[PDB]
Amino acid sequence: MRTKLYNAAYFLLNNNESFGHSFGIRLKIVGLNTWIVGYAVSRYYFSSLRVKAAQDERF
Amino acid sequence: MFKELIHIFRTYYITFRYLKKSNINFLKNLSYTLIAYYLIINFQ
Amino acid sequence: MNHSCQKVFEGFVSALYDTSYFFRNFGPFKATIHYATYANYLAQNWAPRVSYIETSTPAYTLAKNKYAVYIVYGLIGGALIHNYMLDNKAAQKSQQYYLKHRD
Amino acid sequence: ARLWWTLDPSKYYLKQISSGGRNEILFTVLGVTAAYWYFGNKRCEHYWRRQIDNCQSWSRAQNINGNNLTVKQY
Amino acid sequence: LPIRNIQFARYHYLAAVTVFTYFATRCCLLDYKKYYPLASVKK
Amino acid sequence: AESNDATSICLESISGTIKGLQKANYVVEHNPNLTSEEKKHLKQFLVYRYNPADPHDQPKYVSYWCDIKKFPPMFLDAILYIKNELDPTLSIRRSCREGICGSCAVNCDGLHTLACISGFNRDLSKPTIITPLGHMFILKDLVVDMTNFYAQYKMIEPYLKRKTPKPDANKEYPQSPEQRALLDGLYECVLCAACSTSCPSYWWHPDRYLGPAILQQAYRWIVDSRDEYTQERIERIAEDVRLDDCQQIGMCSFTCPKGLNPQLSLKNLMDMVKDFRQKRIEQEV
Amino acid sequence: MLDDTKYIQMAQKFPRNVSVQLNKKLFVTRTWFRNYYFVGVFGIFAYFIYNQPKIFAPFSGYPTTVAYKAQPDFLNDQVIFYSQQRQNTLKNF
Amino acid sequence: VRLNLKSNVDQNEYPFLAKWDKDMRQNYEEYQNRIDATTYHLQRSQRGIAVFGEWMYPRYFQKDILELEV
Amino acid sequence: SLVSLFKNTFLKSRVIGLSFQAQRVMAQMAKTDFENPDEHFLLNDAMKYNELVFYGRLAENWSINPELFGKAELAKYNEAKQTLIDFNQYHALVQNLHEFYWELKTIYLELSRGVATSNFHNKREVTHSIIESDIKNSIHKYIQLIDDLKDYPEWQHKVREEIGYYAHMIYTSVNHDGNFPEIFKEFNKVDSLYYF
Amino acid sequence: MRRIFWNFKTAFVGLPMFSLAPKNILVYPIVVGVPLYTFIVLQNSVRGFAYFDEYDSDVKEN
Ligand SMILES: CCCCCCCCCCCCCCCCCC(=O)OC[C@H](COP(=O)([O-])OCC(O)COP(=O)([O-])OC[C@@H](COC(=O)CCCCCCCCCCCCCCCCC)OC(=O)CCCCCCCCCCCCCCCCC)OC(=O)CCCCCCCCCCCCCCCCC
Ligand SMILES: CCCCCCCCCCCCCCCCCC(=O)OC[C@H](COP(=O)([O-])OCC(O)COP(=O)([O-])OC[C@@H](COC(=O)CCCCCCCCCCCCCCCCC)OC(=O)CCCCCCCCCCCCCCCCC)OC(=O)CCCCCCCCCCCCCCCCC
Ligand SMILES: CCCCCCCCCCCCCCCCCC(=O)OC[C@H](COP(=O)([O-])OCC(O)COP(=O)([O-])OC[C@@H](COC(=O)CCCCCCCCCCCCCCCCC)OC(=O)CCCCCCCCCCCCCCCCC)OC(=O)CCCCCCCCCCCCCCCCC
Ligand SMILES: CCCCCCCCCCCCCCCCCC(=O)OC[C@H](COP(=O)([O-])OCC(O)COP(=O)([O-])OC[C@@H](COC(=O)CCCCCCCCCCCCCCCCC)OC(=O)CCCCCCCCCCCCCCCCC)OC(=O)CCCCCCCCCCCCCCCCC
Ligand SMILES: CCCCCCCCCCCCCCCCCC(=O)OC[C@H](COP(=O)([O-])OCC(O)COP(=O)([O-])OC[C@@H](COC(=O)CCCCCCCCCCCCCCCCC)OC(=O)CCCCCCCCCCCCCCCCC)OC(=O)CCCCCCCCCCCCCCCCC
Ligand SMILES: CCCCCCCCCCCCCCCCCC(=O)OC[C@H](COP(=O)([O-])OCC[N+](C)(C)C)OC(=O)CCCCCCCCCCCCCCCCC
Ligand SMILES: CCCCCCCCCCCCCCCCCC(=O)OC[C@H](COP(=O)(O)OCCN)OC(=O)CCCCCCCCCCCCCCCCC
Ligand code: SF4
Ligand code: F3S
Ligand code: FES
Ligand SMILES: [Ca+2]
């Protein structure tokens, strides 16, 4: 059975002011939360790093 | 807040649709327990 | 998929389903899960709280339910302040003791 | 978009027990007792300490095999 | 309808969020090792 | 006899995606034997064509150059001119011709709308693109599978239910002109689905979330004074994300060719659901 | 009051012998999607909560440490070690 | 201290003692820069105000102290 | 027997108290759909739902001491115990239907992930045999279930409206060629006409 | 063969996304963090960004 397909609406709709206005707020909140979580993860990651070793050192 | 994160993941990710409301609630309970533990432990 | 791999996969998923079902529905395991679920519900949905819906006329609400927040705050603040005072007293006592013992 | 942020408590968790308000004083008593015990132990350990450094503070080292630790000058 | 100690609940939730964010991000306790090359010296 | 094909399918999918991005908006000229001089006098329509019944067919734009001085100025008129004069295999739904049935809803040049009452850019330079409704499965050409839309419409019980017998049975359910005008601008929906195919929440969750149109119909049956199942309908639409998924984008009221305002109806429904949730606690005590 | 007549009837009168066989494969597929979204998504948050304190507060997890003193052994070219137990504590604030 | 990289030990008579000194002097500058950065971070943090600083200086800046000792 | 007195008092209190609520909880469970029948209790208000689920087992299993019971009290306790057992069976039935619903929804989710626009890596033109067999057997079981609920028009209608929805969506997801006539043979009889 | 139909320059998912998303994602980050980060960094340096040299940096081995 050949599965049916469709043309995604957002690929063929003229850009509108409503999309912009609403997705702007959604992206603002997404950016805020992502920035907070990424800052936490960045602090964790950098603090996880090892200490600098000597030159040509084994173990 | 937690509710909103779950709602966004459900509405945008097709795979996340697999989870029941019961599994979501279990994640909610575990997250609340972990948050309480974090708050308590940081001060110890 | 290949029908041989199909046989293997069907057998494996059947084994997984059977293992999960047995572990969940076994007598002692079933009882353990059944009790722990209710314990978790009690803990999560009936944890101690300071804010709650008041559905009773002022004549039908106890005094405890009007001053519980204040009692809790008094207890916690008193505990913190008393621990601070005990820390200071212990600092002074230790300093004096080790001073009088030498130098 | 819809506004959803708020600090108000959710009605799902706002119920009381049959006999009155939730068990707040009873749990706070336990919390205060536990905090008292924990902080008392911490204070007692912390404040009554001194560092005594003399020959009697040193003992002979040994391996996990129990033998005396000695390393050659290889 | 009335909610006992609603304001206390709001402030407790706000405090919990603030404390959790403070410890998770350590926003206030930054690192200044990156600024050391860009700092003057005394003594 | 068959074997595992995860690798072949994966490679084919990636390669096809890349190629389609390179060759997006594939176009085939209906009549290549046209002198570029002639095309100065004719406007270009890019019509989406796809016949899943034929195993050898794939989606594609087809370019038709037509003289716009031969038929009236509407999308449906141009589509039917192309069908009758150029290629009568084109497929599209059409009943009313005056924007009432709502069958001809299509993506008329970037905007979902009824093709029968929508004009097209008269300029001969900019091409016009006619495609089916976006997020609906395509059956053939400009014909989509609106079955799910109707199935959702059925779930709201769109029939007057009354819990109180009529006093005399020789009269009509009384309703003052105010309780009737309360429905004005709300019962004119023709179920074209043009709005709901433009709602992003309906793009993401077609099944769990009812469309703006169906929810507007539920609101119409709720605000109606003659029906007595107000609270029951409110509760029914309050399940999971049948209504909560709406994010008040407002595109629904912008696209509606009939001029209706489904966004306002959904806002009122949300307010009523919130009040219902609160007073299920406040009242019963 | 809501007219729950039909739901009340459904609750009162339900079959007590009707059951449906469950395709084990699909049940397992859904459950393992759930496990995928637990271990690989909520696992990140859980491990962060569990470990980040152990990264920013390490001294409270290792209470006792050891210190050594050494002496030479010339006649055998050896080194003699004396160990000592200490309470692992901050140093050089 | 800006110690020179050229060891002053005699390699002919004290080989290991010369090698140890050479390696120490070679890595001393880099490790000194790291130590200075850590100490600057510690003292600047201690100069903070209330929660941003002093109120929680000694107890919560533990990884920095551990790095400094290492 | 002080411990016996306390055990019996606890059992009586919990069981009788919950028995007055079983009607409401069961009605609410019926009201929602089969995707998450306990959705209202998890999200909106736990109207003694978890209490019923927990104490049904105790009512079934824990013993009784009639000498600690009155006459009318013992009759009331037996009635409440029977009500709790009825709730146990009702919950089991709802769980079975809900899991079957999730089976069908799993099939539909696989199809949807197949036809998703973001699916640039696993796009398949032709449905494979395994999912076709799964669809056929799932629809067979669904038809058998509908038949088995001929004595309960409300239950039959709810099962249709809830579970058959995803069967209809699966029907819409694919073209009418290949093995389609055979796969949806049972569905084409009545259900297909309902979902139009 | 996957055929994609897309208006790159006018569809809501296209150049309009490039114009919209970057200026909306960074709204709260900039307007909050930058003042907040500046306050957090400067409040330490009431007197200056001085490194009190605990080690003899000016002393070089002869
Ligand atoms: C498409 C390809 C793209 C490729 C990209 C490749 C990128 C490679 C990056 C490499 C690593 C860079 C690390 C920089 C560290 C900076 C901090 C620092 O120096 O710390 C010193 C660091 C110690 O860190 P720490 O002090 O403990 O804590 C650091 C923290 O950041 C805390 O420090 P802080 O407290 O000072 O923090 C400052 C504060 C500052 O915050 C603020 O105040 C924010 C201010 C923002 C202002 C922005 C203004 C922009 C203006 C916009 C205008 C628009 C107008 C539009 C108009 C339209 C029309 C109207 O917070 C932040 O900086 C926020 C950071 C959190 C980020 C949150 C988001 C995370 C997720 C998203 C990531 C990006 C995805 C992009 C996807 C793109 C897709 C197309 O130690 C060092 O000396 C290390 C130096 C850095 C090198 C590390 C090397 C590690 C190597 C690992 C191996 C693997 C490498 C792989 C490389 C691959 C390359 C391809
Ligand atoms: C350094 C520290 C360690 C870092 C790594 C830590 C990893 C921890 C464990 C992570 C476990 C993840 C898996 C469990 C979660 C649930 C997954 C799931 O739904 O399973 C089924 C689902 C598959 O469903 P399906 O049915 O096969 O797909 C068809 C459905 O319609 C699809 O429907 P759908 O909506 O469900 O599918 C969306 C799907 C996404 O899946 C997809 O459908 C597509 C995935 C590939 C997209 C690739 C980009 C496409 C083009 C976009 C434009 C890019 C432009 C770049 C250049 C710009 C130049 C200016 O979303 C997810 O995968 C959800 C979770 C995603 C975030 C967590 C994973 C992060 C991995 C980061 C590392 C990846 C490896 C290194 C890559 C770089 C090497 C140089 O996911 C998978 O099985 C794949 C999992 C992801 C694999 C990696 C793909 C790349 C992702 C990159 C994200 C980067 C984010 C930025 C921050 C990164 C910071 C590190
Ligand atoms: C403290 C140290 C020792 C701890 C030991 C813990 C042992 C737990 C074992 C659990 C075993 C399974 C239990 C199954 C259930 C059996 C009982 C039952 O069905 O309930 C009967 C009874 C009545 O139930 P019901 O009739 O169904 O009522 C609910 C209905 O909705 C009807 O509602 P209603 O409106 O009719 O009102 C009825 C009311 C009636 O309730 C009452 O009457 C109970 C009121 C409280 C106790 C009153 C008595 C106080 C004096 C006791 C003296 C005992 C002396 C013992 C001496 C022993 C000597 C050998 O019910 C309630 O209000 C329920 C209260 C639930 C409280 C839950 C507390 C959660 C938070 C706990 C941790 C808090 C940490 C805070 C830290 C924060 C730091 C900043 O409820 C209880 O027994 C409540 C038990 C609650 C706690 C259980 C779980 C504790 C877990 C703690 C966390 C540990 C995590 C460790 C890591 C994990 C791996 C180890
Ligand atoms: C196997 C079993 C199953 C396992 C499943 C897997 C997961 C594990 C489950 C285990 C079960 C327990 C889980 C933890 C509880 C989860 C609760 C939850 O999710 O609730 C969500 C739920 C969320 O509701 P919501 O609607 O979002 O509203 C939340 C808002 O925050 C609204 O909040 P609110 O407004 O209602 O406030 C709450 C209330 C809660 O607080 C309390 O009332 C409790 C107090 C503490 C009691 C601690 C008792 C601890 C007893 C321990 C005994 C030893 C145990 C040993 C056991 C050993 C093993 C047997 O807060 C307060 O009372 C605020 C006090 C503030 C004091 C301020 C001080 C002021 C001083 C100055 C005075 C004035 C001076 C003036 C000077 C003027 C100068 C000019 O929370 C609540 O509604 C309840 C409140 C939150 C309770 C949190 C409790 C956390 C406990 C964690 C314990 C971890 C123990 C680990 C042990 C490990 C051993 C190895
Ligand atoms: C490392 C830290 C560890 C601690 C912290 C843990 C934190 C995390 C949470 C953990 C949660 C999961 C726990 C593990 C699962 C346990 C499952 C289980 O019990 O399996 C039984 C279950 C069999 O029972 P069944 O099938 O439910 O019942 C039918 C049977 O034929 C039997 O029929 P039957 O009638 O012959 O016998 C019925 C009854 C034996 O019947 C009796 O003899 C009577 C028992 C007491 C009845 C309640 C009287 C309450 C009177 C008022 C007390 C007031 C106190 C002061 C407060 C006043 C103000 C509120 O036996 C049971 O079923 C015992 C179940 C456990 C206790 C249930 C009672 C709860 C309420 C009372 C305790 C809590 C305080 C509530 C206070 C407030 C009340 C309003 O399955 C098994 O046999 C599995 C065995 C293998 C698994 C491990 C078994 C462990 C056994 C532990 C026994 C503990 C006894 C209590 C010790 C209390 C010390 C102070
Ligand atoms: C360390 C690893 C880091 C890697 C970084 C990778 C970054 C990935 C960023 C992804 C952004 C989001 C899109 C992918 C994920 C979508 C998930 C989702 O829910 O979507 C589902 C939906 C699709 O599904 P749907 O529309 O079918 O919705 C589901 C509907 N049902 C349930 C009915 C099936 O959305 C999409 O996937 C939209 C895809 C849009 C793709 C846009 C591509 C733009 C490319 C721009 C290139 C610019 C180049 C410039 C070069 C300049 C040179 C000079
Ligand atoms: C938005 C949604 C997604 C969000 C995701 C969020 C994720 C949160 C994660 C939380 C946990 C964080 C854990 C951080 C661990 C970091 C380890 C690391 O790589 O550190 C860098 C390390 C070198 O560091 P170090 O030794 O300290 O040296 C510098 C000292 N000054 O580097 C090394 O030592 C290098 C060797 C180790 C790293 C190997 C990595 C292998 C990756 C294999 C990828 C395979 C898949 C490829 C796919 C594409 C194929 C075409
Ligand atoms: S809601 Fe608007 S667009 Fe949709 S059918 Fe009704 S009138 Fe037409
Ligand atoms: S366009 Fe879309 S999501 Fe809500 S209000 Fe209007 S429907
Ligand atoms: S052609 Fe009649 S309404 Fe569209
Ligand atoms: Ca009405």
PDB file of C-alpha atoms and ligand atoms in Angstrom, chain A residues 6 8 10-11, chain B residues 12-14 17, chain F residues 135 203-204 206, chain I residues 108 112 115-118, chain J residues 6 13 18, ligand 6:
ATOM      1  CA  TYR A   6       0.943  15.893   2.013  1.00  0.00           C
ATOM      2  CA  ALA A   8       3.431  20.880   4.761  1.00  0.00           C
ATOM      3  CA  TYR A  10       4.207  26.215   6.476  1.00  0.00           C
ATOM      4  CA  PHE A  11       6.184  25.536   3.287  1.00  0.00           C
TER       5      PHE A  11
ATOM      6  CA  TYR B  12       6.366  19.063  18.898  1.00  0.00           C
ATOM      7  CA  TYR B  13       7.962  15.598  19.196  1.00  0.00           C
ATOM      8  CA  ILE B  14       6.077  12.766  17.506  1.00  0.00           C
ATOM      9  CA  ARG B  17       3.536  10.853  22.015  1.00  0.00           C
TER      10      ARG B  17
ATOM     11  CA  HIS F 135      -1.541  19.375   6.017  1.00  0.00           C
ATOM     12  CA  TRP F 203      -0.778  20.907  12.041  1.00  0.00           C
ATOM     13  CA  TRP F 204       1.028  19.293  14.961  1.00  0.00           C
ATOM     14  CA  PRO F 206      -4.592  16.674  13.999  1.00  0.00           C
TER      15      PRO F 206
ATOM     16  CA  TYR I 108      -0.846   4.734  13.963  1.00  0.00           C
ATOM     17  CA  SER I 112       2.714   8.976  11.309  1.00  0.00           C
ATOM     18  CA  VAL I 115       4.872  10.142   6.847  1.00  0.00           C
ATOM     19  CA  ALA I 116       6.281  12.928   9.035  1.00  0.00           C
ATOM     20  CA  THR I 117       7.845  15.848   7.194  1.00  0.00           C
ATOM     21  CA  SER I 118      10.922  15.847   9.443  1.00  0.00           C
TER      22      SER I 118
ATOM     23  CA  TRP J   6       8.548  25.162  -0.867  1.00  0.00           C
ATOM     24  CA  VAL J  13       9.672  28.839   7.177  1.00  0.00           C
ATOM     25  CA  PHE J  18      16.116  34.094   9.697  1.00  0.00           C
TER      26      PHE J  18
HETATM   27  C1  LIG K   6      26.329  18.599  18.788  1.00  0.00           C
HETATM   28  C2  LIG K   6      25.232  18.441  17.762  1.00  0.00           C
HETATM   29  C3  LIG K   6      24.645  19.765  17.310  1.00  0.00           C
HETATM   30  C4  LIG K   6      23.844  19.668  16.022  1.00  0.00           C
HETATM   31  C5  LIG K   6      22.951  20.868  15.756  1.00  0.00           C
HETATM   32  C6  LIG K   6      21.718  20.537  14.933  1.00  0.00           C
HETATM   33  C7  LIG K   6      20.663  21.630  14.928  1.00  0.00           C
HETATM   34  C8  LIG K   6      19.275  21.130  14.575  1.00  0.00           C
HETATM   35  C9  LIG K   6      18.224  22.222  14.490  1.00  0.00           C
HETATM   36  C10 LIG K   6      16.852  21.713  14.088  1.00  0.00           C
HETATM   37  C11 LIG K   6      15.789  22.791  14.003  1.00  0.00           C
HETATM   38  C12 LIG K   6      14.363  22.265  13.926  1.00  0.00           C
HETATM   39  C13 LIG K   6      14.070  21.381  12.716  1.00  0.00           C
HETATM   40  C14 LIG K   6      14.371  19.893  12.900  1.00  0.00           C
HETATM   41  C15 LIG K   6      13.601  19.219  14.027  1.00  0.00           C
HETATM   42  C16 LIG K   6      12.091  19.332  13.905  1.00  0.00           C
HETATM   43  C17 LIG K   6      11.352  18.620  15.028  1.00  0.00           C
HETATM   44  C18 LIG K   6       9.862  18.767  14.939  1.00  0.00           C
HETATM   45  O1  LIG K   6       9.104  18.623  15.859  1.00  0.00           O
HETATM   46  O2  LIG K   6       9.471  19.074  13.701  1.00  0.00           O
HETATM   47  C19 LIG K   6       8.425  18.255  13.133  1.00  0.00           C
HETATM   48  C20 LIG K   6       7.732  19.023  12.041  1.00  0.00           C
HETATM   49  C21 LIG K   6       7.581  18.203  10.790  1.00  0.00           C
HETATM   50  O3  LIG K   6       6.504  17.263  10.976  1.00  0.00           O
HETATM   51  P1  LIG K   6       5.040  17.577  10.431  1.00  0.00           P
HETATM   52  O4  LIG K   6       5.038  18.934   9.846  1.00  0.00           O
HETATM   53  O5  LIG K   6       4.571  16.436   9.612  1.00  0.00           O
HETATM   54  O6  LIG K   6       4.200  17.641  11.780  1.00  0.00           O
HETATM   55  C22 LIG K   6       3.739  16.419  12.403  1.00  0.00           C
HETATM   56  C23 LIG K   6       2.374  16.209  11.808  1.00  0.00           C
HETATM   57  N1  LIG K   6       1.828  14.813  11.894  1.00  0.00           N
HETATM   58  C24 LIG K   6       1.784  14.373  13.321  1.00  0.00           C
HETATM   59  C25 LIG K   6       0.440  14.788  11.333  1.00  0.00           C
HETATM   60  C26 LIG K   6       2.686  13.867  11.116  1.00  0.00           C
HETATM   61  O7  LIG K   6       8.523  20.213  11.722  1.00  0.00           O
HETATM   62  C27 LIG K   6       9.634  20.050  10.988  1.00  0.00           C
HETATM   63  O8  LIG K   6      10.309  19.058  11.003  1.00  0.00           O
HETATM   64  C28 LIG K   6       9.929  21.268  10.166  1.00  0.00           C
HETATM   65  C29 LIG K   6      11.247  21.151   9.412  1.00  0.00           C
HETATM   66  C30 LIG K   6      11.725  22.471   8.838  1.00  0.00           C
HETATM   67  C31 LIG K   6      13.080  22.379   8.159  1.00  0.00           C
HETATM   68  C32 LIG K   6      13.705  23.724   7.835  1.00  0.00           C
HETATM   69  C33 LIG K   6      15.089  23.620   7.218  1.00  0.00           C
HETATM   70  C34 LIG K   6      15.788  24.960   7.045  1.00  0.00           C
HETATM   71  C35 LIG K   6      17.197  24.848   6.482  1.00  0.00           C
HETATM   72  C36 LIG K   6      17.941  26.170   6.418  1.00  0.00           C
HETATM   73  C37 LIG K   6      19.349  26.059   5.855  1.00  0.00           C
HETATM   74  C38 LIG K   6      20.080  27.388   5.765  1.00  0.00           C
HETATM   75  C39 LIG K   6      21.449  27.293   5.116  1.00  0.00           C
HETATM   76  C40 LIG K   6      22.138  28.636   4.937  1.00  0.00           C
HETATM   77  C41 LIG K   6      23.463  28.551   4.197  1.00  0.00           C
HETATM   78  C42 LIG K   6      24.077  29.902   3.880  1.00  0.00           C
HETATM   79  C43 LIG K   6      25.341  29.820   3.048  1.00  0.00           C
HETATM   80  C44 LIG K   6      25.899  31.177   2.698  1.00  0.00           C
END
